[PDB]
Amino acid sequence: HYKVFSPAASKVCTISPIMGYSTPWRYLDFNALNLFFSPL
Amino acid sequence: VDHEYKYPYVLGQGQDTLAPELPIWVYFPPQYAYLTVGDVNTQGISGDSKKLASEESAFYVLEHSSFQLLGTGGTATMSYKFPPVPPENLEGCSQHFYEMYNPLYGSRLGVPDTLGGDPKFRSLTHEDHAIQPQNFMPGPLVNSVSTKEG
Amino acid sequence: LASEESAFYVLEHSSFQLLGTGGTATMSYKFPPVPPENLEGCSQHFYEMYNPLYGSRLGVPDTLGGDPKFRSLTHEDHAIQPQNFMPGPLVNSVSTKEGALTGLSTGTSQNTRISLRPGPVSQPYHHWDTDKYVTGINAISHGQTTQGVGRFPNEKEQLKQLQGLNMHTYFPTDQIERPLMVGSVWNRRALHYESQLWSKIPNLDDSFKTQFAALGGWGLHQPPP
Amino acid sequence: ALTGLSTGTSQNTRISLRPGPVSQPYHHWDTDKYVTGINAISHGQTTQGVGRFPNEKEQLKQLQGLNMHTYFPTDQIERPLMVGSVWNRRALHYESQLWSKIPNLDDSFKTQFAALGGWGLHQPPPQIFLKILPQSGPIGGIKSMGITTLVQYAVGIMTVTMTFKLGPRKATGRWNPQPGVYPPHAAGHLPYVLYDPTATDAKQHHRHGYEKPEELWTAKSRVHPL
Amino acid sequence: HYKVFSPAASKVCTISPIMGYSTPWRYLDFNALNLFFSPLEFQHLIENYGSIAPDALTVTISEIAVKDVTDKTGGGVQVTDSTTGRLCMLVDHEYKYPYVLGQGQDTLAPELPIWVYFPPQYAYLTVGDVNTQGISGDSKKLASEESAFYVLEHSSFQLLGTGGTATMSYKFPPVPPENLEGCSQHFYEMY
Amino acid sequence: PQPGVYPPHAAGHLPYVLYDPTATDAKQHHRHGYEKPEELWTAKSRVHPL
Amino acid sequence: PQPGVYPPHAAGHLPYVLYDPTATDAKQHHRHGYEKPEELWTAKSRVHPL
């Protein structure tokens, strides 16, 4: 199920309340230099 | 594979969604979610506002696209070519860009000594290195202060 | 005290030429393509590029508030003429009258500073205003006239383009510094007879409009060896 | 008095810097109101009166909105042009100018777009100057005619053809429809349509049946992800 | 006649009093987007395309008619066609003369095709020395060696008779296109 | 200009977009945030003479 | 005419020319007859429209 992301906004909050979509898909993430180089 | 960047890009935001740092750990890929624009709508009396969806809100359904179905034991490859980007320098500097002069010799230029409507200028010596004229300015700083200043 | 990063150079450790009496040796260097320095001025103010006979079709605010009203501009209110391009940035472009280490300087405390004279080439430090010679607090003197009166270039072309000294900038509030605005136009400090001809751009990670050195001439990443 | 962004040598000797850089708006629809900047330029007025400005929604969406404070640990409006910045230019609207000449000064920074709209050009469309060649009046045996000029005026048809390079619409993968490309709203009834003002209910008869929108036709209706 | 434009300066004034020259020449001003697109055509443009950038320009002065005006019978004036009258047209391809287009002034060609254009009179502003008017204290920018006095009659221009035509072409530089499409995300909410 | 090709209107908020019914004050909570237009999307918005 | 390209003015008599300081009433005998202009020679005498 696609879900909506809409928390309540009313201490510091964002400029405006956020909204988005959560999808049933997972996505790869390898955005790091240390994932490709061992310490040696 | 979002080759055409059709769906919102959430990588490269410092999120705790990264692959494990050692090869002996199992990667649990993050669930895909994104943030889109909308209309701020008040929730009655309380004044609390929610970003309700709007006509500009982008509702992306990934099932409405052509993707691959891979069975057990299958494989699939993606290739990508980075654009030409400035290389990151792995070596430092042994000089200060504001100390790029000859310490033995004073400047041929002069600096103000007495101010006013008719200022007088004094010639520079090597005993006052703090007033040596600079060819290039330092880089911009915006709120570059320590936590003790804040 | 010297550290591990301290660069101690022994020039006798490299190969060089030994030349006897009557000998000769030549060095050749090719300058990188650089922006030529314009030898000609401007007969107009970039903010007076409009037709003086006709008012603008664009109105400007007249009454402020939550529901402001706008007035169409006549042909005699030229102080409110809209501008297509912004003036160039000014950083401490003040005169000695309005200005130990003086002028533009940066450091860790009042007593621990280094001077940033003469400042960016985008601003002058001496020019002939309408009836007086105005010298900036960040002025460098290519010699002096007899300590005494300094010898400076006359930056009339920068005075003509909103870059003059003590040119205030008002944000509705009053200050001297002009931020580098998008769509800005400015004149560089004019090349003069005694100016230096080049200077090495420090090979830092990034640079912004380092084509011309503040002391004069051109900024070169590989200057004459 | 002169308001807005202005530069000069004194409070009484200034020039206005309106509308300011293209990196910032001067009018946009906020959450519940139309916020208009102090540096705003109005392409005409609606019945001195209320101004006509574009809706700079795209700049408001990207931290460039009006009265957007920036805090440094300490509360000001001015934002430095910091390294790695991203911003939206003021949107091109229907009534905007198409070009302006960049003054050929020594240096310029991001002068690709003029503040009043259009594109800044170092060699813009050349100026075409027209006049009528004067013709002398009769001089001779007539009784003290004197030097005169023949009463001549010129007419003609000036035809201008401009080509615009056009880019294809970006591909969209949304499920929901893109926002409709709304024709802009007029102060009374509809814009760009000749109509009978007497048949309308509004009192906006001063324009005599043909009206322009109060909001400058700004486009940028269809949206794409970042 | 060429006139000098030097209003007196002394309520907010400019940094320096403005001085310029007014010439007997008119010029064409068509620097507007609405002149080239009808509302329907602009709607089509913003609906079917995602970016726009000027490419080329062509200006044609056709159906030229220099007309003499004489006294009409019973009062009034009457208008006749002149076979000897000429129209001086000069295209400033070299940008020799000061450029006053693009400053957003009420000099544009009419928005509707049914109206008649009245090209604005050419004038420009140039530099000078600010001189005080004695004890009064008022200042005026007087002409100098740096003041640019341009006489357009000191250059070669076309004399076009009645019914003549004259064309001008221009090629825009590769300017950045203006995006016609918005954004469905905030750049600070891309996480 | 031709009449705008309006996206269809829904009984509550907007159609074909997944919204949060609790955020909205509309009474179409039964659809659970995804709604259909109350008028069938018909096209034929741009008009031409006869 | 364009503004003249004047050679720069010197504090006493003329610059870049060797003169007899005793032959003039200038107060710059310390330069011994050869002088630098008090203003740096900057060019940009000829102006063009923007």
mmCIF file of N, CA, C and O in Angstrom, chain C residues 1 10 15 18 22-23 31 38 45 54 72 79 84 87 104 112 119 123 133 135-136 140 209 211 218:
data_model
loop_
_atom_site.group_PDB
_atom_site.id
_atom_site.type_symbol
_atom_site.label_atom_id
_atom_site.label_comp_id
_atom_site.label_asym_id
_atom_site.label_seq_id
_atom_site.Cartn_x
_atom_site.Cartn_y
_atom_site.Cartn_z
ATOM 1 N N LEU C 1 57.731 27.599 15.262
ATOM 2 C CA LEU C 1 58.829 26.666 15.082
ATOM 3 C C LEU C 1 58.518 25.718 13.931
ATOM 4 O O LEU C 1 57.357 25.383 13.672
ATOM 5 N N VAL C 10 66.286 23.340 -0.246
ATOM 6 C CA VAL C 10 67.695 23.533 -0.562
ATOM 7 C C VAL C 10 67.803 23.574 -2.079
ATOM 8 O O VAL C 10 67.621 22.555 -2.752
ATOM 9 N N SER C 15 69.241 20.305 -10.118
ATOM 10 C CA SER C 15 70.171 20.534 -11.213
ATOM 11 C C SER C 15 69.972 21.934 -11.775
ATOM 12 O O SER C 15 68.846 22.331 -12.092
ATOM 13 N N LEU C 18 75.697 26.095 -14.627
ATOM 14 C CA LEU C 18 76.883 26.846 -14.239
ATOM 15 C C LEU C 18 77.403 27.564 -15.475
ATOM 16 O O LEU C 18 77.784 26.916 -16.455
ATOM 17 N N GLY C 22 81.202 35.590 -19.695
ATOM 18 C CA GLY C 22 80.808 35.707 -21.080
ATOM 19 C C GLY C 22 79.705 34.769 -21.511
ATOM 20 O O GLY C 22 79.268 34.844 -22.666
ATOM 21 N N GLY C 23 79.241 33.893 -20.629
ATOM 22 C CA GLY C 23 78.178 32.977 -20.974
ATOM 23 C C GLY C 23 76.827 33.662 -21.030
ATOM 24 O O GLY C 23 76.672 34.844 -20.728
ATOM 25 N N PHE C 31 52.396 33.146 -21.684
ATOM 26 C CA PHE C 31 51.311 33.483 -20.779
ATOM 27 C C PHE C 31 50.049 32.711 -21.159
ATOM 28 O O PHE C 31 49.764 32.531 -22.347
ATOM 29 N N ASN C 38 40.993 46.569 -20.621
ATOM 30 C CA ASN C 38 40.446 47.584 -21.508
ATOM 31 C C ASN C 38 41.162 48.911 -21.295
ATOM 32 O O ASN C 38 41.272 49.397 -20.166
ATOM 33 N N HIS C 45 26.701 56.296 -17.873
ATOM 34 C CA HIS C 45 26.473 55.575 -16.632
ATOM 35 C C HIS C 45 25.544 54.405 -16.924
ATOM 36 O O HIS C 45 24.503 54.580 -17.563
ATOM 37 N N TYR C 54 11.160 59.747 -21.905
ATOM 38 C CA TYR C 54 9.973 58.932 -21.707
ATOM 39 C C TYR C 54 10.001 58.277 -20.337
ATOM 40 O O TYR C 54 11.036 57.764 -19.903
ATOM 41 N N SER C 72 2.488 54.862 -11.537
ATOM 42 C CA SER C 72 3.254 54.914 -12.773
ATOM 43 C C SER C 72 4.231 56.083 -12.739
ATOM 44 O O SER C 72 3.928 57.161 -12.220
ATOM 45 N N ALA C 79 15.158 59.165 -10.145
ATOM 46 C CA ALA C 79 15.776 58.434 -9.048
ATOM 47 C C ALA C 79 15.096 57.096 -8.792
ATOM 48 O O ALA C 79 15.640 56.269 -8.056
ATOM 49 N N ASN C 84 17.998 47.118 -14.963
ATOM 50 C CA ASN C 84 18.125 45.748 -15.447
ATOM 51 C C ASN C 84 19.255 44.993 -14.761
ATOM 52 O O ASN C 84 19.161 43.773 -14.589
ATOM 53 N N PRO C 87 24.610 47.025 -9.464
ATOM 54 C CA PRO C 87 26.005 47.458 -9.366
ATOM 55 C C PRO C 87 26.876 46.379 -8.745
ATOM 56 O O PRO C 87 26.399 45.443 -8.101
ATOM 57 N N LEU C 104 40.538 47.335 5.584
ATOM 58 C CA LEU C 104 39.993 45.986 5.566
ATOM 59 C C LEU C 104 41.038 44.988 6.045
ATOM 60 O O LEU C 104 42.119 44.875 5.460
ATOM 61 N N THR C 112 45.376 40.554 16.490
ATOM 62 C CA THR C 112 45.880 39.481 15.634
ATOM 63 C C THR C 112 45.115 39.542 14.316
ATOM 64 O O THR C 112 44.056 38.924 14.165
ATOM 65 N N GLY C 119 42.057 45.428 -1.148
ATOM 66 C CA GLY C 119 40.719 44.921 -1.324
ATOM 67 C C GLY C 119 40.511 44.385 -2.723
ATOM 68 O O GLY C 119 41.439 44.325 -3.535
ATOM 69 N N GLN C 123 36.554 47.303 -6.646
ATOM 70 C CA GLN C 123 36.323 48.594 -6.024
ATOM 71 C C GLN C 123 37.586 49.438 -6.073
ATOM 72 O O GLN C 123 38.699 48.905 -6.059
ATOM 73 N N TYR C 133 39.740 65.048 -4.274
ATOM 74 C CA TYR C 133 40.375 63.748 -4.446
ATOM 75 C C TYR C 133 40.074 62.889 -3.224
ATOM 76 O O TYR C 133 40.471 63.234 -2.105
ATOM 77 N N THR C 135 40.457 59.356 -1.280
ATOM 78 C CA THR C 135 41.347 58.212 -1.151
ATOM 79 C C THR C 135 40.760 57.234 -0.143
ATOM 80 O O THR C 135 40.395 57.628 0.969
ATOM 81 N N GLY C 136 40.671 55.967 -0.535
ATOM 82 C CA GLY C 136 40.071 54.970 0.325
ATOM 83 C C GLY C 136 40.977 54.557 1.467
ATOM 84 O O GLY C 136 42.193 54.744 1.445
ATOM 85 N N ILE C 140 46.598 51.549 -1.572
ATOM 86 C CA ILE C 140 48.026 51.285 -1.678
ATOM 87 C C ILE C 140 48.646 52.396 -2.511
ATOM 88 O O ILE C 140 48.042 52.870 -3.480
ATOM 89 N N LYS C 209 36.802 34.589 -9.655
ATOM 90 C CA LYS C 209 37.205 35.759 -10.434
ATOM 91 C C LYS C 209 38.606 36.231 -10.049
ATOM 92 O O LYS C 209 38.856 37.417 -9.830
ATOM 93 N N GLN C 211 41.079 36.367 -11.964
ATOM 94 C CA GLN C 211 41.791 36.671 -13.199
ATOM 95 C C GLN C 211 42.727 37.860 -13.039
ATOM 96 O O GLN C 211 43.751 37.935 -13.728
ATOM 97 N N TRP C 218 47.623 40.597 -13.866
ATOM 98 C CA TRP C 218 46.769 39.438 -14.064
ATOM 99 C C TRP C 218 47.114 38.362 -13.046
ATOM 100 O O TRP C 218 48.269 38.232 -12.633
#
